[PDB]
Structure 1
């Protein structure tokens, strides 16, 4: 009953989900209790064909039926799901709901300034996606191409991603906070034929130089033939290059409000998302179509307990995987409205998150602990001004959540009446790996709890590389078989993919994280074992910051470490031996302080 290895586990009472959760639940839950969960879970590991087969047919609409549920192994890096099947990501996210209820809200868009907020119905989204898709089709964008997206977190970003997917092309979303150099690297690696952006961005009332950074990068991007520019501010001083740049509003007006979607194979790439690794240059993580969409829909439904009547607010950016899966693909596949927030939790005041939740009666809130830490510092008193009683599920993502923040999250936001789901996962998993199912799995503050369907989690002895049997254990977190939404390769560098995930511990997938398993099977994430730092939820590479410092002619040696920060979670401190990081990686990746030694 006492853990000698998992010291976080001693004396931690299980936290049942509050009674108000089930009062607010609009229908009978998708899973009765944890005992039904383990039965379903045991099938997803022992019999994936019988478990995922029906779920894929239930949750997805297919243009061609699949003949094989599961293929490949980790050691060979040839995983595949629903082979032979065809579908379209934008049909499952838009069309099928537009035909059913075209007036149902799809994108609840809360702008940086609330005056600019708006709502797109599923019918509205279909027309806007069709029109943008029509623009790209006339430009020659076809299945197999990649299209870059450099946009803030607003309606246009979602429309761009779905419009690209509508044609069978693969979108590559570049976070709007990246510098011009980072844009150059990602666009060139994928050899994108087109780019979608805007003139300027609004964030916290400040104006972002979006189109300006694109131009600086595009001088070294010979593959980019055309650029679509949305007039977000309509600043007339923004230069467009004749013959290359065209306005979003001008071109979409030329095309009809419906365009047929293009069928793609289950294993055709849906998108590339570039992530910073422990060594070298950022790598383009590739996700399939069917496996990723099933992972997105399945986790959104069961881990958050989403029903058609619900409304999800994921306070994350599509520049990162959190926005891809749980701001766009997850909720739209299920046909529920999703709240797309362009601004910050502090503008105009630290009650923005809560005013939004109250305004739209959101039932699910998904946020990073970094924001929780900041709101506890500057805006705790603002919570009580707003209703917030429509919520029943509160999500945590991107970084470990201390038991302290978990309790504050539960009490001040949840009124001690909501379920909290600390979801562990990463860009390469596509969707959740370990997380407490809402209304099913009791919580231990600071623990991700049980592995999700299809995730056979394990602990490996780092010194011997041998899997650790039994509980009260610690080691590197690894998965024993692949899962539908697992990333399939690194763009045109499958060797880097293998050396990173499949080769370090043959037969397993290597998460790069350490974890612990207590007497009850609950998993406690202990953080990265490589040289990767998660600052404010953003995965950074200490090697990538060191490389930026060395680019300066003054610097000869540079080493980046990590410290504990009560607001940024993890801070990075640079040691240099004889603004550069803000122009190489981006303002968000800047060192906290540079120490000259």
Structure 2
């Protein structure tokens, strides 16, 4: 009952699902109780083929059957699922539902200003997706290409993503808050052939310069051949470059409301999602989609009658998986909110839920803290009795915020799903299944299907057996929606996720496991570099070098090494002193913590320099490293 390590768990009563949850539930739940959940989970770990095989044929529609459910290992970074299978993301998110019930709502779009809100049915969505795909197809976009999206969180963003996927190309969504420089970096790394954007945006009543920032970036993006521009404000002063920029409404009017979707392999890339050097996290098609549908269905308890409001942005993985793919795969309506939680006032989130009788709400604690600070009294003004599942994503939720969320939004009648996951996981890793798992406020509870979670000692990399334990959070095998690579940089992928703790997937997070098996996310770890099995701290070495009174500044970075895995390179600003500094680190940290080399002369720049790859300071590091690295 008592915990000596997981202090968070001491004195925490399980919180059973409120009875009103099941009264509002449209059908019998997908899982009866925790005993059934454990039986299914154990199979998903010991017999992935027998577990995910049938589910993949149930939840997804295939153009070609797969012959192997699961292939590859973490250690080799060659994970693959449903090999030989072929499918299309937009067919599974649009076509199949439009044929069944074309009038069912698909995108409930709430604009920055409600006067501009509107609803697209699945039939409406198929026509818009088909028309945009037709425009891109006539522009030469085909399987294997990348297309950039720089759009606000509205229908056009969702249509653009699904149209790109309809042709077998990968979309790369760029958050509409990014600067021109951030657009340039991501477009060039992906070598996008086309870009979809709009003239201007609306956020909190203000006008944002969307197209203007694209033009600024495009002067340095030679791969972009054509741009489709939607008239979001229809400002006549917004310039379009002849021969490159074309209007969404003008071009889409030329094409018919049906276009055949293009089959892609299960392991063909569905999208690139750049992370904040930006890395293009790449996701497969079949595996990702299954994870999105599976987690949306079982963790949120989503039925055909339900309505999902994910207060996220397609610019981030949350919007990808739980505003778009998850809900549309299951054929339910999804609420796409373009504005802010405060405009026109601080009751907007709740006005939207009441308007559309949303049954599921998914938001980040950052937004809950704001509404608690400035708009708490607005919540009671709205009927929120349609809700039964309240989700939280992206960051620790304190027990105090959990209770506030539970009381003021849920009226102590909803289930709360504190979902732990990350961009590279594609979908939920640890979360309480709605109506199944009892909650402990601040704990994500059990690992999800196909997620064999473990705790690793950060020094030895060895799994920690038993409960009341703490350590590095790691997964012991790959899972269907796991990211497959970093675009054209698979070595950075291996060095980040598979090599730090060989045989495991490295989440970068620390966590604790209590006597009931519940996981408590404890936050980021301290970025250790693995040199021949000894894990080193770049920050700890910098501190040891600085202790030398002749040293004024010190910067230590890590790079890939073909022999020792990683190598540590230390840069110092003030031959015999170089050896004295290495001896200093040995006697301070340890004999095996000595840098591979000490160079007397933004660590992002130092890493690339060390691997042969105040702006005026950059010159000194390049020439200094190239002259004294030698031995």
TM norm structure 1: 0.89
What secondary structure sits across from 1:197 in the alignment? strand
Relative to 1, partners in 2 of residues 1:580 and 1:446: Cα closer, same or farther, differing over 3 Å? farther
Relative to 1, partners in 2 of residues 1:193 and 1:326: Cα closer, same or farther, differing over 3 Å? same
Contact 2:364–2:392 (Cα < 8 Å) also in 1: yes
Contact 1:177–1:586 (Cα < 8 Å) also in 2: no
Deviations 1:104-133 (A, max 9, x none): 000000000000000000000000000000
Alignment of 1:304-453 (within 5 A): 304-453=300-449
Relative to 1, partners in 2 of residues 1:283 and 1:549: Cα closer, same or farther, differing over 3 Å? farther
Relative to 1, partners in 2 of residues 1:570 and 1:493: Cα closer, same or farther, differing over 3 Å? closer
Alignment of 1:488-499 (within 5 A): 488-499=484-495
Contact 2:358–2:386 (Cα < 8 Å) also in 1: yes
Unaligned runs of 5+ in 2: 574-581, 601-631
What secondary structure sits across from 1:242 in the alignment? coil
**1:571 and 1:526 mapped to 2: Cα distance?**
28
**1:122 and 1:539 mapped to 2: Cα distance?**
52
**1:448 and 1:125 mapped to 2: Cα distance?**
35
**Which structure 1 residue ranges, 4+ long, deviate > 6 Å from structure 2?**
531-596
May I ask how many residue pairs the two structures share in their alignment?
A: 592
The Cα shift of 1:543 comes to 12
What secondary structure sits across from 1:354 in the alignment? helix
**2:83 and 2:240 mapped to 1: Cα distance?**
44
Unaligned runs of 5+ in 1: none
Contact 1:280–1:544 (Cα < 8 Å) also in 2: no
Aligned equivalent of 2:586, options 572, 582, 589: 582
Relative to 1, partners in 2 of residues 1:594 and 1:375: Cα closer, same or farther, differing over 3 Å? farther
What secondary structure sits across from 2:438 in the alignment? coil
RMSD: 8.6
What secondary structure sits across from 2:536 in the alignment? strand
**2:286 and 2:503 mapped to 1: Cα distance?**
24
The Cα shift of 1:393 comes to 0.1
Relative to 1, partners in 2 of residues 1:555 and 1:324: Cα closer, same or farther, differing over 3 Å? farther
Contact 2:526–2:537 (Cα < 8 Å) also in 1: no
**2:399 and 2:20 mapped to 1: Cα distance?**
22
**2:510 and 2:166 mapped to 1: Cα distance?**
39
Counterpart check, 1:269 vs 2:278:
no
Relative to 1, partners in 2 of residues 1:450 and 1:50: Cα closer, same or farther, differing over 3 Å? same
**1:47 and 1:24 mapped to 2: Cα distance?**
34
Relative to 1, partners in 2 of residues 1:592 and 1:74: Cα closer, same or farther, differing over 3 Å? closer
Counterpart check, 1:299 vs 2:303:
no
The Cα shift of 1:157 comes to 0.2
The Cα shift of 1:154 comes to 0.1
The Cα shift of 1:140 comes to 0.1
Contact 1:370–1:569 (Cα < 8 Å) also in 2: no
**1:301 and 1:348 mapped to 2: Cα distance?**
33
Relative to 1, partners in 2 of residues 1:540 and 1:425: Cα closer, same or farther, differing over 3 Å? farther
The Cα shift of 1:464 comes to 1.1
In structure 2, the partner of 1:13 is 13
What secondary structure sits across from 1:54 in the alignment? helix
**2:90 and 2:584 mapped to 1: Cα distance?**
40
**1:555 and 1:84 mapped to 2: Cα distance?**
59
Deviations 1:454-482 (A, max 9, x none): 00000000011111000011111000000
Contact 2:531–2:567 (Cα < 8 Å) also in 1: yes
Contact 1:182–1:585 (Cα < 8 Å) also in 2: no
**1:494 and 1:522 mapped to 2: Cα distance?**
33
> Which range moved further: 582-591 or 526-535?
582-591
What secondary structure sits across from 1:511 in the alignment? strand
Relative to 1, partners in 2 of residues 1:257 and 1:280: Cα closer, same or farther, differing over 3 Å? closer
Contact 1:148–1:195 (Cα < 8 Å) also in 2: yes
Relative to 1, partners in 2 of residues 1:586 and 1:517: Cα closer, same or farther, differing over 3 Å? closer
**1:202 and 1:248 mapped to 2: Cα distance?**
18
The Cα shift of 1:350 comes to 0.5
**2:404 and 2:51 mapped to 1: Cα distance?**
38
Relative to 1, partners in 2 of residues 1:492 and 1:569: Cα closer, same or farther, differing over 3 Å? closer
